Amino acid sequence: ALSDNPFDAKAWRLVDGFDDLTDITYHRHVDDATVRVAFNRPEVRNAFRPHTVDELYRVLDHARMSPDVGVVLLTGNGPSPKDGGWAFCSGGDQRIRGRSGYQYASGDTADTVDVARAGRLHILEVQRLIRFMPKVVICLVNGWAAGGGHSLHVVCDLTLASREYARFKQTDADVGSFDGGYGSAYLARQVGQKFAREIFFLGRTYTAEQMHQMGAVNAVAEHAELETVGLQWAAEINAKSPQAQRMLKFAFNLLDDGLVGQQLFAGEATRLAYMTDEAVEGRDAFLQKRPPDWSPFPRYF
Amino acid sequence: SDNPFDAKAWRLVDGFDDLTDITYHRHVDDATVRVAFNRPEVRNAFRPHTVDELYRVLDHARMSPDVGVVLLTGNGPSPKDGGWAFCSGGDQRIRGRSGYQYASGDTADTVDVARAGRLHILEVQRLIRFMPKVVICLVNGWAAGGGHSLHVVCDLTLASREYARFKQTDADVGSFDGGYGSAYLARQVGQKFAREIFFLGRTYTAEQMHQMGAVNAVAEHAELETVGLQWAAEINAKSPQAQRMLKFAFNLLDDGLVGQQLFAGEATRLAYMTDEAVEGRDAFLQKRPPDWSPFPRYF
Amino acid sequence: DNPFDAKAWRLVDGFDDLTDITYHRHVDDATVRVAFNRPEVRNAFRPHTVDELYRVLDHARMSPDVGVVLLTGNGPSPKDGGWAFCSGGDQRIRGRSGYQYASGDTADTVDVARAGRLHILEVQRLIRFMPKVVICLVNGWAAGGGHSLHVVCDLTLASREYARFKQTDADVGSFDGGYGSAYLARQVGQKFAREIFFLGRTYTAEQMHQMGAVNAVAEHAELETVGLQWAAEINAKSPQAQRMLKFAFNLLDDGLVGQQLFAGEATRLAYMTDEAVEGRDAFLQKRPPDWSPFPRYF
Amino acid sequence: ALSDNPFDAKAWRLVDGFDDLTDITYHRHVDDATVRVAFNRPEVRNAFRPHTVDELYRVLDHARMSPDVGVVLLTGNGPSPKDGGWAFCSGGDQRIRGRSGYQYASGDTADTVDVARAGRLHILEVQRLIRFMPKVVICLVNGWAAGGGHSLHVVCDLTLASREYARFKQTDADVGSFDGGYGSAYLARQVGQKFAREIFFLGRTYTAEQMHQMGAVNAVAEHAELETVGLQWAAEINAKSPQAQRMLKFAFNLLDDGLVGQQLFAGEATRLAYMTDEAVEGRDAFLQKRPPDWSPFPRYF
Amino acid sequence: LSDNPFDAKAWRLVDGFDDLTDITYHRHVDDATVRVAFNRPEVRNAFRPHTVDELYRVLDHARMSPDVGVVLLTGNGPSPKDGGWAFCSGGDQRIRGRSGYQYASGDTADTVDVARAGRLHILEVQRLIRFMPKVVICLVNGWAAGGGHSLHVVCDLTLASREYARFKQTDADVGSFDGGYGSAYLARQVGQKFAREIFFLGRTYTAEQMHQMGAVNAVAEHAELETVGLQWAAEINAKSPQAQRMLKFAFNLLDDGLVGQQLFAGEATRLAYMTDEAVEGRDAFLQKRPPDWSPFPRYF
Amino acid sequence: DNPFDAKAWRLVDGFDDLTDITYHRHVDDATVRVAFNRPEVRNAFRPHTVDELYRVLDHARMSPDVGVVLLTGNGPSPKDGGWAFCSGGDQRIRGRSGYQYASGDTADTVDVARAGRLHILEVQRLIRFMPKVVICLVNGWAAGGGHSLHVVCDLTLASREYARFKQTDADVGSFDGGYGSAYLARQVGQKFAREIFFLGRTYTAEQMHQMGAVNAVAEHAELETVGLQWAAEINAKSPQAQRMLKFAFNLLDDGLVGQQLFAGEATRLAYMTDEAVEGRDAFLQKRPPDWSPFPRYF
Numbered sequence A, D: 001a002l003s004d005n006p007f008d009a010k011a012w013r014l015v016d017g018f019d020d021l022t023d024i025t026y027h028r029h030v031d032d033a034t035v036r037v038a039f040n041r042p043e044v045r046n047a048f049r050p051h052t053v054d055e056l057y058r059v060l061d062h063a064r065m066s067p068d069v070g071v072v073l074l075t076g077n078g079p080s081p082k083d084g085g086w087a088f089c090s091g092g093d094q095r096i097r098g099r100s101g102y103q104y105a106s107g108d109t110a111d112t113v114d115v116a117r118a119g120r121l122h123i124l125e126v127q128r129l130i131r132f133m134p135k136v137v138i139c140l141v142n143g144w145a146a147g148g149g150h151s152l153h154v155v156c157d158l159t160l161a162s163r164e165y166a167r168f169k170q171t172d173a174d175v176g177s178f179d180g181g182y183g184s185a186y187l188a189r190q191v192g193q194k195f196a197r198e199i200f201f202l203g204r205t206y207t208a209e210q211m212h213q214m215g216a217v218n219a220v221a222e223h224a225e226l227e228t229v230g231l232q233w234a235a236e237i238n239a240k241s242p243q244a245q246r247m248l249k250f251a252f253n254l255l256d257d258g259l260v261g262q263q264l265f266a267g268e269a270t271r272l273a274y275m276t277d278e279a280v281e282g283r284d285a286f287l288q289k290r291p292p293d294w295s296p297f298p299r300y301f
Numbered sequence B: 001s002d003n004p005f006d007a008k009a010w011r012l013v014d015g016f017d018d019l020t021d022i023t024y025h026r027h028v029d030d031a032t033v034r035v036a037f038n039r040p041e042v043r044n045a046f047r048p049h050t051v052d053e054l055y056r057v058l059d060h061a062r063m064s065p066d067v068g069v070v071l072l073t074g075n076g077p078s079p080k081d082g083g084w085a086f087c088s089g090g091d092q093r094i095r096g097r098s099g100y101q102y103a104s105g106d107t108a109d110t111v112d113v114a115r116a117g118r119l120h121i122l123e124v125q126r127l128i129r130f131m132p133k134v135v136i137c138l139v140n141g142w143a144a145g146g147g148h149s150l151h152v153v154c155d156l157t158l159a160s161r162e163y164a165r166f167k168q169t170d171a172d173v174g175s176f177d178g179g180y181g182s183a184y185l186a187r188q189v190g191q192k193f194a195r196e197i198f199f200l201g202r203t204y205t206a207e208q209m210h211q212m213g214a215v216n217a218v219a220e221h222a223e224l225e226t227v228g229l230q231w232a233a234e235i236n237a238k239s240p241q242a243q244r245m246l247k248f249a250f251n252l253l254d255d256g257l258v259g260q261q262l263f264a265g266e267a268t269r270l271a272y273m274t275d276e277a278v279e280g281r282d283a284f285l286q287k288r289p290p291d292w293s294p295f296p297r298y299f
Numbered sequence C, F: 001d002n003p004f005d006a007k008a009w010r011l012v013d014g015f016d017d018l019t020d021i022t023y024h025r026h027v028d029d030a031t032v033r034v035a036f037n038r039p040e041v042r043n044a045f046r047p048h049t050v051d052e053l054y055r056v057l058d059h060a061r062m063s064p065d066v067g068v069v070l071l072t073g074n075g076p077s078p079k080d081g082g083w084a085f086c087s088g089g090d091q092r093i094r095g096r097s098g099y100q101y102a103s104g105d106t107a108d109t110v111d112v113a114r115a116g117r118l119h120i121l122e123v124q125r126l127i128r129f130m131p132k133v134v135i136c137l138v139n140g141w142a143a144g145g146g147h148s149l150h151v152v153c154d155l156t157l158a159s160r161e162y163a164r165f166k167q168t169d170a171d172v173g174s175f176d177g178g179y180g181s182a183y184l185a186r187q188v189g190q191k192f193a194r195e196i197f198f199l200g201r202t203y204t205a206e207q208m209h210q211m212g213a214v215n216a217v218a219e220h221a222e223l224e225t226v227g228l229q230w231a232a233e234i235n236a237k238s239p240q241a242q243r244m245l246k247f248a249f250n251l252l253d254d255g256l257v258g259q260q261l262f263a264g265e266a267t268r269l270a271y272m273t274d275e276a277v278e279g280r281d282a283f284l285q286k287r288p289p290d291w292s293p294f295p296r297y298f
Numbered sequence E: 001l002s003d004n005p006f007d008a009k010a011w012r013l014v015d016g017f018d019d020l021t022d023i024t025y026h027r028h029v030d031d032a033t034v035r036v037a038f039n040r041p042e043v044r045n046a047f048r049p050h051t052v053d054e055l056y057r058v059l060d061h062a063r064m065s066p067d068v069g070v071v072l073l074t075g076n077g078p079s080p081k082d083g084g085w086a087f088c089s090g091g092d093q094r095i096r097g098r099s100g101y102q103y104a105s106g107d108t109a110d111t112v113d114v115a116r117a118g119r120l121h122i123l124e125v126q127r128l129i130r131f132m133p134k135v136v137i138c139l140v141n142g143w144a145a146g147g148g149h150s151l152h153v154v155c156d157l158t159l160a161s162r163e164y165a166r167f168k169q170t171d172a173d174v175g176s177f178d179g180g181y182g183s184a185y186l187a188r189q190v191g192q193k194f195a196r197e198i199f200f201l202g203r204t205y206t207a208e209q210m211h212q213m214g215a216v217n218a219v220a221e222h223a224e225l226e227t228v229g230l231q232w233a234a235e236i237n238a239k240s241p242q243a244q245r246m247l248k249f250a251f252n253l254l255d256d257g258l259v260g261q262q263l264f265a266g267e268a269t270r271l272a273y274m275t276d277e278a279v280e281g282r283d284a285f286l287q288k289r290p291p292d293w294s295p296f297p298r299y300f
């Protein structure tokens, strides 16, 4: 009775308005403030093409703007119908990679590429969306995480990994690519500079336990229980002050992210200020064309 | 006519017939668009719908390969008092305790009570910052509060000699932009002047701001968009690839890992163009070892 | 010709023992005046001066009815009529271990049992970190560490006739390798900051205003009057917004410390909310918190 | 004969001038250049109120200015006389927490709060004192380290922890609070971004060994020996060049702390320069109203 | 079982370096890998200024060798005096003066050229390793102490001898400090708590202990240390050299501020120079005509 | 009207083989003059030029009797009389792999077995990291990489009549994405720096002085005379303090590299102390060090 599949169909419901998804699935939990967002191209180890990225962005953006959702679980569906192989995500689909980047195609192969249309590298936009969203994103690595798939794991707030099937392999340099942003530099902020350089320069395959020991994986779970454990972590996150959780995420981001990090954290501080009687007096005085009266509000130190 | 806008020079854009708070035009000849606040009756204050329209329009420009430069400005003058404005920031009428709120009308009476406020002009700031194209702010009048902060985050600023007025009113109404509006202003005028601008909230002219370092050039009001178009033409006459890389180089360190992500992203694209990268792709697809021998190690 | 208007200022409780510094509170406004009081040596500071200055600024920091600090120098010199804001560390009591405590004014009375100090750096941080605007009124010479004190203040107003900026550090084998130099570059740019230190030339108020280190130039007799006006414009705004803005300006330049100060004020803002009060109450009442009344914002 | 208490009364003497302390204890070692600074409210798991913070600052400042002291051991007294429970520090005293921060009170409970007096969050001032003092501060975690107590451990230079009784738990978001400075961001500089995020977002309880494995605890010690081991570490620190140790602490702080970090490190470099004949010639030339003669001093490269 | 990691059959001397005294320099007989090693095992491979000069010269030559992808940095041994093993024990204290480490005609302080100021220019070697567009693997075959420990830290990767590696940061014991890559950058490997412990207490750590803390990538048997180094180098050399170059500079970038940006952006400029668009910019200038950018799309 | 005064400068031993660069030491002062010597092509540099420039600057770095470097360009052009500081990389030998070594002046003598290089970046770092002030004397056109060299120098003086600043990078499909651009913004601010690169307009000495990238404007004939005066003011200060100050200005902008350089100078200062000597002596004498004479400063 041991399931080879982490997905419990009884626990999840399709989100309204997303019937047209082909490369991604999107579910909301039947009880919890948690959604499940998953790659749905297991025949190519869940490699993403530009359409995949567009769907992924659309889905994550919707989750971001859903007030009754606290946590995103990002994972990959499977296994491959071809060989039963398991994957989180193997990065950009090499079949439609051109000299200008990953290209839109009418089919799955290079011969169907729209030659009039420039390639894109916009999984980077999805990276920023994950980074900047005021909600915890937990990567559930259920299989291979390679290339840009590895880098997506890196930029998520937390990572849980399948004991049996998770395999971490940074294959970028093998195919003449590189993620010189969050995939590499930010990995060093998890495992340190020596281990991060080893991971990219040699491109070896690592287990869930090895990545846990190095600092890039928060916990290892049994494959069949990976989403169950993800849901437990999500519930612990959702049981705290959502205001504090939001502020904490942006505090962790801040200095690493320079002025952008400051912008996001300060933006949340501005919102906190808007809630105060003092900010309301500022608004009211402007609207009423009168001098503001700040006397009720002390100079804290 | 003392209006900067030359109707004959601009054309409407497919898909934007529904715009109400913003106007969007593409130049008749040039690789340049004109994006403008269109609520001059309230000094071009933005409400959340304005922000949505502005984001949509700028995102469209970003994804338009035949467009190299964005001119960001405000329409005018006010039909009520003839006052000129670039943008006076967030519309205070619909500001609530949770931020700026959606409303069916122009005033607080019609705010959707079930819907939390937003501060998402910050998303527009990031869109301007991260887009691989030069954004020139044309300050044609009052630039106050969040309007002032939009001017600050733009790559370049041209301002009307007669009518541009820079006034950072944030602290007057109990608000603050603690990101690009303040800290990034200091990277233009220095810390002393930036602090003065915010702490005292005085009104400055185009010439004064040019002297401090936040305004690139001062133009006659009637000529502001003509000068903007000339600046755009000089930008568009250079290597688009070089211009792209330069913008992200200027952003990089100030923007930390995000800046690195954007610049490195462009470097990845440059690498994908190489025969070496194509060999990496081909070897994977052909299930064979790559042959790197033709590609020398540079130093 | 003196910038000081005695009628506008009152003494402060608990500071009757001050010798090197003066400290006044404005008669009407939420503004204090903090001034070097050693004009016979161009207002050079000794370690006792630094201790007094720290004490006074800390007091102003903790005074809820004070919004703005005017930092300046008294004068003129009774000996030659020269005007000074501050000429930096008192070289008379400078030793190999830094500036030394002495019972008198010269090296003759240095306490041998006591190592030297460079703790004007503590005053620089106090100015930097305090949630109130500090305006330097440069009424005369600003040299060495006195020049660096001007640099670290939020704003600077300067006497047209008598302000003289001269970074003499390298002339006497010293250097401010922190706020005095690197932060000067964040005001006038790297080229001008390097020029100011490497050549140590004398600059006027107008020249420094042109470079970006002086906010405005005022007539000498009006310097404190103009300072009070600036203070009044500052004090007419939201105290909360002003606090947040100062820390936002500091933040990234100050790394984790800047984040600590800014995030600290964000924490205070959070504590004011009903959501934070429920967190407190639930803990005190030994029950689970109920977060359902509080929407997730985006 | 196994002691339940790490404190060895025979090894410590009260510091003169501190008879009025109520919330904090302060001892100097009978032989070593080491002091012991401890929370003294074990009945509420060594939670600090604003008076506690004032005493803590006073004591740490005195240690800072004591030239015959090289190392500070920061710990908590105990156990609770109520239930025998052990704590390092449980953060801000929630009983006197109000909308403006932690408030001064005449008693221990909310009804004795001076309502006319604004609240403070000035444990942040103690964090900076620990960070900026030119001496090594070793946290000895002898029990619960929760909330602000956890953040104090994080900002110390080194941490040793009780095998049996140390418990690390970041409860901030549970009570709607957050440390968005050293408590969170700087924790990431010890355990990496993934683990730091886990510690705050889930607020689980961790053992000494778990925190040691993640990188936030330097070593685990037997509870009875925790202060003995702390003293041994202090003795190894005090056996080296005090000048080098000072420069090293500020080197470690420097870049994480931006211009403030630079100020502190450059300030010590200025001190080193003042010791030189070249600097003395600069002083002498000024005092003697003559040009300086730099010819005896070679340019180095 | 060999007590020595060095396999003489696998290495050939590099031409032009027969005058080296304090350093050895070999090129692998088959691989794109060089071996650069301290050669003063009688004093635990402590470096003097001449050592630093030779080391810089050799590393600079490897940097400028297009047929070399990886540098293995290690120490020769054992000591003929006592059979002790060292990677590098840091600056030679015998010729340390008040102005830094001084050039000397001999081994001892009495042979120091007093007219010539001291230097601390192992820092120049640290920068050379940091900035070179090739992976440098430190093979810690024995003691790594003081400045020798800091060299280990600045390398891209470190492999260490199970039996003989010993890590000990003795700086503060002799009144010295590396307040740059040796300390601050160590914190970027093991975290701030462990890095502070390493410097403030100066304890000796094993290869396994440093591996657990995050400063050592892997532990190898002493006899196999260079064999494993060569295997790691081969894995590195089997990838796109262009990608490896960009990755190294991406890892350096933000930690290294504007200098990091300069190096990464430099490589980006090189990539741009390869494009037809860049060639059109050049051609238009040379041909005294306006450039035509119309063939080159804007990308987003 | 030539800025160069032949009677004031002497050749440096060991450099009679220079072809693209000239190198002189002042006959009286602790100052050297390093100049581009290809005025027929507006002083564009080829890889050999960069090699010579590095060699000469490195020699100046290691010369204890030299405190200041004046970096400039020789002229005028013998062909059209035009003046140049430096017009950047020589486009005649620019290839897809960078600037190429050639035995002659054009692409037809390029050695193809030799990959192109962009190693003016190495010279930029050498200028940045050398513990001496480098003053750029812009005597004419400063364009492309020549403009970026001006930017990275500590100070810039410029010819009123003939200095012309023009960032032509994007015009020829190139870009300096490091010190040339990002660091320019640390002198003139982000708006002006973006303007300079994105539009590539020509600016005068006075315009660049007003923006913050030129320290002072001088008459063309007096440009080196003024440079020597600035050098003399620099050389009249504590060389130790000047060294520390340069590295303090560099530090945070240069991250860990900045820290490495500044901390390295701090280590040297510590080595001078009796305390450090005791540490050395105890190790050499195989005995415990005695730190008791050395107080714990605060």
Ligand SMILES: CC(C)(COP(=O)(O)OP(=O)(O)OC[C@H]1O[C@@H](n2cnc3c(N)ncnc32)[C@H](O)[C@@H]1OP(=O)(O)O)[C@@H](O)C(=O)NCCC(=O)NCCSC(=O)c1ccccc1O
Binding pocket: A270, B041, B042, B043, B045, B080, B083, B088, B089, B090, B091, B092, B093, B119, B121, B142, B144, B145, B146, B147, B167, B169, B170, B173, B175, B176, B177
């Ligand atoms: C902009 C300024 C200085 C113009 O002065 P003036 O020439 O006197 O125009 P006037 O004040 O008469 O305003 C003209 C009309 O437009 C309205 N109006 C102007 N600006 C408005 C605004 N933001 N919201 C709503 N109505 C506005 C006015 O209420 C007035 O309406 P009526 O009298 O005809 O009924 C002067 O008008 C001014 O100071 N406006 C306020 C600028 C401001 O403070 N905005 C918010 C600051 S903070 C911010 O923008 C922000 C936003 C998002 C996030 C963070 C933020 O900090």
Ligand SMILES: CC(C)(COP(=O)(O)OP(=O)(O)OC[C@H]1O[C@@H](n2cnc3c(N)ncnc32)[C@H](O)[C@@H]1OP(=O)(O)O)[C@@H](O)C(=O)NCCC(=O)NCCSC(=O)c1ccccc1O
Binding pocket: C040, C041, C042, C044, C045, C079, C082, C087, C088, C089, C090, C091, C092, C118, C120, C141, C143, C144, C145, C146, C166, C168, C169, C172, C174, C175, C176, D270, D286
């Ligand atoms: C400020 C300046 C340029 C004024 O020059 P001048 O107008 O000609 O006045 P004068 O130089 O005659 O000074 C008037 C009297 O005050 C003394 N005096 C002035 N400044 C003094 C000072 N700092 N310390 C002790 N006595 C002082 C003078 O020795 C003189 O005394 P008498 O002849 O009447 O007996 C000119 O006075 C000047 O250059 N002063 C020195 C500027 C300076 O070098 N400050 C210290 C640099 S290092 C520093 O400040 C520092 C300290 C701690 C930490 C970091 C640091 O960088």
Ligand SMILES: CC(C)(COP(=O)(O)OP(=O)(O)OC[C@H]1O[C@@H](n2cnc3c(N)ncnc32)[C@H](O)[C@@H]1OP(=O)(O)O)[C@@H](O)C(=O)NCCC(=O)NCCSC(=O)c1ccccc1O
Binding pocket: C267, D043, D044, D045, D047, D048, D082, D085, D090, D091, D092, D093, D094, D095, D121, D123, D144, D146, D147, D148, D149, D169, D171, D172, D175, D177, D178, D179
């Ligand atoms: C510390 C902890 C985990 C221990 O739990 P446990 O071992 O089960 O004991 P218990 O929870 O029963 O507490 C024992 C007694 O001490 C009180 N107590 C413990 N900590 C207290 C505290 N901070 N304030 C007031 N009373 C306290 C308790 O209320 C209880 O009192 P009685 O029932 O005997 O009457 C568990 O007690 C716990 O979770 N404590 C709270 C940790 C916490 O949330 N601190 C504040 C969070 S925010 C913060 O620390 C902070 C502070 C300043 C600035 C920024 C900040 O984020």
Ligand SMILES: CC(C)(COP(=O)(O)OP(=O)(O)OC[C@H]1O[C@@H](n2cnc3c(N)ncnc32)[C@H](O)[C@@H]1OP(=O)(O)O)[C@@H](O)C(=O)NCCC(=O)NCCSC(=O)c1ccccc1O
Binding pocket: E042, E043, E044, E046, E081, E084, E089, E090, E091, E092, E093, E094, E120, E122, E143, E145, E146, E147, E148, E168, E170, E171, E174, E176, E177, E178
């Ligand atoms: C390396 C270490 C820990 C090994 O100790 P051990 O295995 O017990 O052997 P021993 O200490 O007897 O040393 C063996 C022989 O080599 C000499 N030796 C070893 N290292 C030396 C060194 N650096 N300088 C001169 N002679 C050395 C020794 O003096 C001894 O010679 P003899 O008694 O046979 O005549 C043990 O030897 C040790 O602790 N070495 C000290 C490493 C150190 O801390 N050096 C300077 C600190 S600062 C630094 O390293 C540095 C360097 C460059 C730039 C910046 C820097 O901060």
